[PDB]
Amino acid sequence: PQITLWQRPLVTIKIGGQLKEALLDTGADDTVLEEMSLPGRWKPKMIGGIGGFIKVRQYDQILIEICGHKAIGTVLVGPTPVNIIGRNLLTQIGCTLNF
Amino acid sequence: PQITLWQRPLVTIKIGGQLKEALLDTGADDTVLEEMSLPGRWKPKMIGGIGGFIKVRQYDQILIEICGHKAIGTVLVGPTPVNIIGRNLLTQIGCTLNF
Ligand SMILES: O=C(NCc1c(F)cccc1Cl)[C@H](OCc1ccccc1)[C@H](O)[C@@H](O)[C@@H](OCc1ccccc1)C(=O)N[C@H]1c2ccccc2C[C@H]1O
């Protein structure tokens, strides 16, 4: 699909059998979701945004469906203001910027 | 052009006779640039992202040339770690997300 940017590029994602809304964010290197429970062990990671840094939990090889497209990759969990789908997963679904 | 997301989507912009590198950020509602001098009146504003909020100066009706395309819109100036081209201007150059 082709998504314009007159409004936030929010899409529905499915993770852990649950539907959530997330933002397709080309400015985010990684994918970070709001506090939730995921399987396996996690590793620590620090990500920096416009307001500073936050500590998140990194989970690898997580299944996530974005707009019906299945992806399997790294997902960060932490105190993010909104669910963010970053470049690591945008590339998996073949997302590009066009103009 | 068609921009892939393997790397950060950085482009060159021209604002106030100055060339700067900026990130095409679909996750950003507005455009925010590092501290610089811009003509005209401005209003204080607080924007929140990953890490918290930062105070910026809001300038309106600013002209910017993005990768060769002219665009007019609001530009926020403040302590951002990187120059960000947000949706307010991305829409003006006809930028869309595709997959
Ligand atoms: O910060 C953002 N938007 C804030 C904002 C606003 F609310 C109004 C006007 C302008 C802006 Cl930038 C955007 O985030 C979505 C969001 C929407 C609404 C509220 C909070 C977050 C912005 O795109 C955000 O995702 C992005 O900010 C720009 C940037 C880019 C590179 C380095 C520093 C700052 C960002 O923080 N990216 C980092 C990130 C995110 C997740 C995982 C890893 C990493 C590493 C970096 O790449």
Distance in Å, CA A22 to ligand 1 centroid: 13
Total domain count for chain A? 1
CA dist A9 and B39 (Å) reads 32
> Cβ of B50 and A69 within 8 Å?
no
Could you tell me if B24 and B95 are in contact, meaning their C-beta atoms sit under 8 angstroms apart? Answer: yes
Name the structure determination technique: X-ray
Q: Which domain holds residue A80?
A: 1-99
Tokens of A4: 């314009």
CA dist A24 and B74 (Å) reads 22
CA dist A88 and A40 (Å) reads 20
- Domain of B86, CATH number, reads 2.40.70.10
* Ligand 1 pocket residue status of A32, Cβ below 6 Å: yes
Residues of B in contact with A1 (CB under 8 A): 98-99
Tokens of A13: 């994602």
Q: Which of A11, A13, A90, A97 to mutate to test the interface with B (most CBs of B within 10 A)?
A: A97
Q: Which residues contact A67 (CB under 8 A, 6 or more apart)?
A: A1, A11, A12, A13, A93, B99
